[PDB]
């Protein structure tokens, strides 16, 4: 089988699927929805011509003459195996296309074994004889225009997609945009959808290492396709809401505990530009007490020792006296 | 893949139901064994 | 039937760009490789894929494969680029697997001027006639470009039978030199009265003669 | 869109988050039934007239700025939390801050590891109060007055 | 550091057989596939065949099947391309070239090459003809001193002068292909005319494969 | 859309197995911590 590496594509994958010539288009490890918007490292194209009945053998986990002794696919195959009928073109008849039936062992996945070695199924060690019990392993396709269903010629091109092998230059179109840093954006940096802010990475990477797989198997390292710089992927800033309430018959005053984020980061870590105008009073406070589990915004710090009414994290309590955010006495 | 994987899903929920109710019964005979430690700690080795 | 076709030569100025291509029908469906062979040593690979380069060779050399062409680009041409280049498209070739090589491109740098040839002709000495043998030697070693035509005439007869000529080779200061030898028995050395070594370079000719004592 | 798929099941993760919330409030209840038995805190006394019973490792130290004791300086230093918290991976990490951490991708996990409501200096304050109750109180300090 | 070491040069008769070798060390030789590429002087590089050393499977070019006997031995890690029934067109340099571990098979390491000579000429010891300036247009009118060597078939002839102590102005041209098969070199010098009678000149010619050395002093 | 409904549904059941395991563990922590509340009340605040 012929092998081609394809490196630079900016054009789309829309011609893959979406045509009636492509009759069989089962994609195992990827969806056809992902074809239009993806970005990958390497593209390999494998091409051969088979019969119609052995179309089902070219799959993960399938067996036969072709899948054992001619062409092997792995079980975790990411890509699309394509089959289409070619009855007019290859069948004139013509017997020039061959296949391998006899081999000593089954083939490894994506491994090519070209040989004209006589298979030893007989007692004698005969060499170079095309006769009885010296089996020549190559047999010919008997293609005629009188072929039945499953015995007509079919043409196959197999596309495989790879990760963490090459600098990513093979990926489809979006809106023409330039890079910004130090702000929270939907980055598509080598074309993957996600939200994060990237800095320059201090890691030294070999040039086959393009992406990264962490302990949760997400992308944590990435390299630019134009400049050969290295950057890491983390998402934007986090925080939480824990509301201080008395009973609703008493008062409608509240305060917010923020659970562990420093108070200069908490206007930035919340989406305060798109927030409700009530809550940004409760995000930037005049009396803000930083403690171990963050800081409480929307109440007043007093020093005086009161017994606890509302049990609140990191040694603070609240009481209705206005609501005071006091270090609790014990 | 589809039918054997649906069998592994059903047998995995059957095995998870078996080990979930056996973890709850492991908590019940574990509470009965903590009870069978405290009983005979002051039932046999002591007097309640 | 697939055979790789390459042009014979291309000449560029130093510091400029060079366009060397190896392109045929449906070469974009196959892989292209490129190699460098200097004169008299082992070949070195300089381009690994359609565009990817190996280590050692810098970003001066680049290429691309699209359609019916695969063109190597050489940027900021220096003196060291003058070598032989071959494209190595692998093909199935009717299920007989072949490693097809190209015809070869010879890339030459410019910047060296033309010098006129000076001729040195040598008579056969008396010590070689003591060994009963004669040799008329004409050495030309003072011109930079091309190959000159050496002719011999002896007593209104153009002598061709007996002329042995070494191929011209690069000397130490990278300039061409050619050597021609004529073998003769010593009794015809004194029989014929006139001899000539005539050298033609770019239309003009330089001719000198020798006297047989 | 995942969150809309999760709200198609409705009240799983309401009860799952309420169950872990009840576990966290239950650990606050465990922390208050263990340590917060009394509301009569005796503060840390000058070390005098203890009869020779050397309590220097279990009272809090004056030298170190936190209220953790030298026996607690053994126990808080050998138990590795593997950098589990809120601020360590979420607070400073608007961008790439402290990569190749001991635990990774908690940003895609969202493990809000809350600090305890009684902190370790205030657990040290309650246990020092329970200490000074045991030094110069009987069992009478848990019975109100 | 992957290196490929070939054997010494070959001198042969037509119809004989070669034993061209290519030794490799420092890497696992059996996993990696070896090609042989020939190159005549004045011609492009020509693929001859491909060889897998561990399995022993050999594929050959469509013109060269049967004649070519590419073999191997992992006992001493040496390959052997033994071509048989030598003919006059088979004079070239032979390169052992390894394809890559990755697929599509770029050639990544080569050998330095060894040269085979196919001719029917016999071996013969060298004869020495000197030339010295003794007259006008051989002396005076811009002409040199020399020593001419012929009647030798193998390539290595070592020339140094005046007991091997003269270096200045020495030119050693490559040997011309004479039609009888016996090659010839001409060595010249540039010397001062006043030093012709005061300094003696000796032409030393050494040739190891025929073991014949003819040397004598050169004077006008 | 029905494809990643089932593909995300394969990822959904990991958390309930976790909080069931952590809730039997939290019942064990609650048993040892009511045991610890009993140990402060009857070993520190009293004598058992």
Residue numbers in the entry:
A (entry chain C): 353 to 444, 447 to 675, 691 to 699
B (entry chain B), F (entry chain A): 990 to 1037
C (entry chain L): 1 to 213
D (entry chain A): 748 to 892
E (entry chain H): 1 to 220
Sentences from the paper on this structure:
Here we demonstrate that broadly neutralizing antibodies can be isolated from peripheral blood mononuclear cells of convalescent patients using SARS-CoV-2 receptor binding domains carrying epitope-specific mutations. This is exemplified by two human antibodies, GAR05, binding to epitope class 1, and GAR12, binding to a new epitope class 6 (located between class 3 and 5). Most of the neutralizing antibodies bind the spike receptor binding domain (RBD), and in particular class 1 and 2 epitopes within the receptor binding motif (RBM), directly blocking interaction with the human angiotensin converting enzyme receptor 2 (ACE2).
We next performed structural studies on two broadly cross-reactive antibodies, GAR03 and GAR12, binding conserved epitopes in proximity to that of antibody S2H9712. Initial cryo-EM studies using a GAR03-spike mix that had been incubated for 30 min were unsuccessful due to significant aggregation and sample degradation. However, a shorter 1 min incubation of GAR03:spike at a 3:1 ratio improved sample integrity and this preparation was utilized to solve the structure of GAR03 bound to spike glycoprotein. Examination of the cryo-EM map revealed that density could not be observed for the N-terminal domain (NTD) and RBD of one of the three protomers (essentially an S1 domain), with the GAR03 Fab instead occupying the space of the NTD while being bound to the RBD of an adjacent protomer. Given that the S2 domain of all three protomers are visible, we hypothesize that binding of GAR03 to an RBD causes the NTD and RBD of an adjacent protomer to be displaced and become flexible, with the averaging methods employed in single particle analysis cryo-EM making their location unidentifiable. In contrast, neither GAR03 (blue Fab cartoons) nor GAR05 (green Fab cartoons) can access their respective RBD epitopes in the down position due to steric obstruction from either neighboring N-terminal (both) or RBD domains of adjacent protomers (GAR05) within the spike trimer.
